[PDB]
């Protein structure tokens, strides 16, 4: 009985920005879903494919953890449906999702006193994303009918925009840390599942 390292993804000191969400594999474990549900620190624990109270007897071929940091308001855009902006340009969920989303407030940690800069979010893309596609590339993006010769006027704006994350805003704007678990039962021997 060798437990699996979830503690290395939830208590990590640094989380990736939304447009470059971290994507970690987990395999060859005995995952303990008891802690992840009973905990009193989360503020949004949701599961779509399988209700939380029966995760102790479902063996998956593989499991992935996505991790990132989003605005407090926009946490209502991480869902199969419920499209919008962030789910439209940065991280889109597949429609037949079988997984869970865990979002909790981190007002104290991820917000500095004078104004942070390490967190950026995408804007101004050519077309809406497709499920799970990661686009970390930065290229100067065009407004309308104008050649893009490397510089910004009323023609080509730089996509990424910077979060402020001031420590004195209302509850609707302080950062929220999000971890999305995705389960997979591909044709292979079952490895990871609870005791």
């Amino acid at each position, epitope marked *: 009985t060798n437990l699996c390292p979830f503690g290395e*993804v939830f208590n990590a000191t640094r989380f990736a920005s939304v447009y470059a969400w971290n994507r970690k594999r987990i395999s060859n474990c005995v995952a303990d879903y008891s802690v992840l549900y009973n905990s009193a620190s989360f503020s949004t624990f949701k599961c779509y494919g399988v209700s939380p109270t029966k995760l102790n007897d479902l063996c998956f071929t593989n499991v992935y953890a996505d991790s990132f940091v989003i605005r407090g308001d926009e946490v209502r855009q991480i869902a199969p449906g419920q499209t919008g902006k962030i789910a439209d340009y940065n991280y889109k969920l597949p429609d037949d999702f079988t997984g869970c989303v865990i979002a909790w407030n981190s007002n104290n940690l991820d917000s500095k006193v004078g104004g942070n800069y390490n967190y950026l979010y995408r804007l101004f893309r050519k077309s809406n994303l497709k499920p799970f596609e990661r686009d970390i590339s930065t290229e100067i993006y065009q407004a309308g009918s104008t050649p893009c010769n490397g510089v910004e006027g009323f023609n080509c704006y730089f996509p990424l925009q910077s979060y402020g994350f001031q420590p004195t805003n209302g509850v609707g704007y302080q950062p929220y840390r999000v971890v999305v678990l995705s389960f997979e039962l591909l044709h292979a021997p079952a490895t990871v599942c609870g005791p």
Partner: antibody
Amino acid sequence: QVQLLESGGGLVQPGRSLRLSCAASGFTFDDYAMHWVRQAPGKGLEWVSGVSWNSGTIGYADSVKGRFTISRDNAKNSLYLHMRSLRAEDTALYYCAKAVEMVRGLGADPEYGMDVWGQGTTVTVSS
Amino acid sequence: DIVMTQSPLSLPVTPGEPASISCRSSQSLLHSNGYNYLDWYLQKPGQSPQLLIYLGSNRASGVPDRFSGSGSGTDFTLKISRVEAEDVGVYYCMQALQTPFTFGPGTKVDIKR
């Protein structure tokens, strides 16, 4: 053997962009926090930026904050640095270094120990 | 936003004697764990720099046992017990506590005559 190869150097006029790339080969790229460190011509070193083991940046230097943008990719074992709105004072070599302590091997997570260094490029700016 | 200093600024050493270099900070780097986060780095003339000491005094891997690190609070020192012909170049001390990190101005070690 561990290798750290960087590319992207070349003359660039002021007020443009560049995209330096550092590729690592010979270790588990996900258990080491990378760093990008400049080196002025005939002067001392200077820390520029870094990235932890979960693609979470750790802040930039005080005088450069506002333009540089770091990014990572564990699938392709790569670390990219986009650089916008240059000035004449950003000509220097650039090394990409690796941390020493593997994560969760012993309080907090490790960030120090820039042990292995690739041979840096020679970015320059002039008109 | 932490500023260091080093001393002496430049010293000439002769092969076969120890030498001592001091790095000083502004805020004591004693973390909650009780570890000082200073690191000592070396650069040879014409090559990429290399690591000497990490975590205050824990000796780095692959370097000989001729180096020693000590100190705490806001003052740390590096001592080379038996200097030789292959110990010339520049030395730096780097913090690891409060981002952004910083490098000292650098000590220039050369051969005396």
